[PDB]
């Protein structure tokens, strides 16, 4: 998949179909971060860097900083 011009790398298969069919999948050994692993969404279960900090919260933080940048002088104007 892509996010703007950033494309997610994909690992090339190395096993042949015959060898691959003989592989037994045991997700019990897998880490909890990667279970029901999906190439189209590998980071769905990945932990947050800061607990409770959503992406929307950061976006809104930036929006508020922009509003402050544009509106601070309207409330605390300064002379030349």
């Amino acid at each position: 998949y892509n996010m703007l011009v950033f494309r997610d790398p994909k690992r090339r298969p190395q096993l042949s179909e015959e060898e691959r069919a003989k592989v037994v999948v045991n997700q019990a050994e897998w880490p909890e971060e990667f279970k029901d692993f999906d190439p189209d969404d590998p980071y769905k279960n990945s932990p947050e860097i800061i607990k409770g900090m959503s992406s929307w919260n950061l976006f809104l933080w930036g929006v508020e900083c922009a509003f402050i940048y544009q509106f601070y002088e309207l409330v605390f104007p300064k002379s030349i």
Binding site: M53, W61, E64, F67, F71, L74, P77
Partner: protein, 129 residues
């Protein structure tokens, strides 16, 4: 006008079927069987819970105030708490500015009668606005 409506309905139906949440699917099936609305039911449940949790909010507020005032909050202060406090400060500043703008009911400060900008007010194209 009808093909577009059918296409939109089909797309939303596909997306609804796609989600693999047991609770959401169960609620959707139950409401479809009963002919009721799941979203409105969710809204009513939420408002009921918030109505029943108001005094819980008050108790939590007093507990948090005691926690902060006692100094226990700053004893275990970390960088994450610093990030949260910076977010908090930013919201406070933006809310103060918005409150000032709403309080004076104007984006810009009003012009005093002795200011030389009064001419600008007199020469408004539309005095109604």
């Amino acid at each position: 006008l009808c093909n577009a409506a059918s296409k939109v309905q089909a797309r939303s139906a596909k997306k609804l079927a796609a989600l693999t949440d047991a609770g959401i699917q169960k609620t959707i099936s139950e409401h479809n069987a009963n002919g009721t609305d799941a979203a409105v039911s969710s809204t009513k449940r939420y408002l009921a819970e918030q109505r029943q949790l108001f005094h819980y909010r008050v108790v939590r507020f007093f507990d948090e105030c005691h926690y902060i005032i006692s100094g226990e909050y700053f004893a275990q202060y970390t960088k994450v708490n610093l990030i949260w406090d910076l977010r908090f400060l930013t919201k406070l500043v933006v809310l103060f500015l918005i409150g000032t703008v709403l309080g004076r009911q104007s984006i810009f400060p009003p012009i005093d009668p002795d200011s030389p900008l009064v001419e600008a007010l007199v020469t408004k194209v539309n005095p109604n606005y």
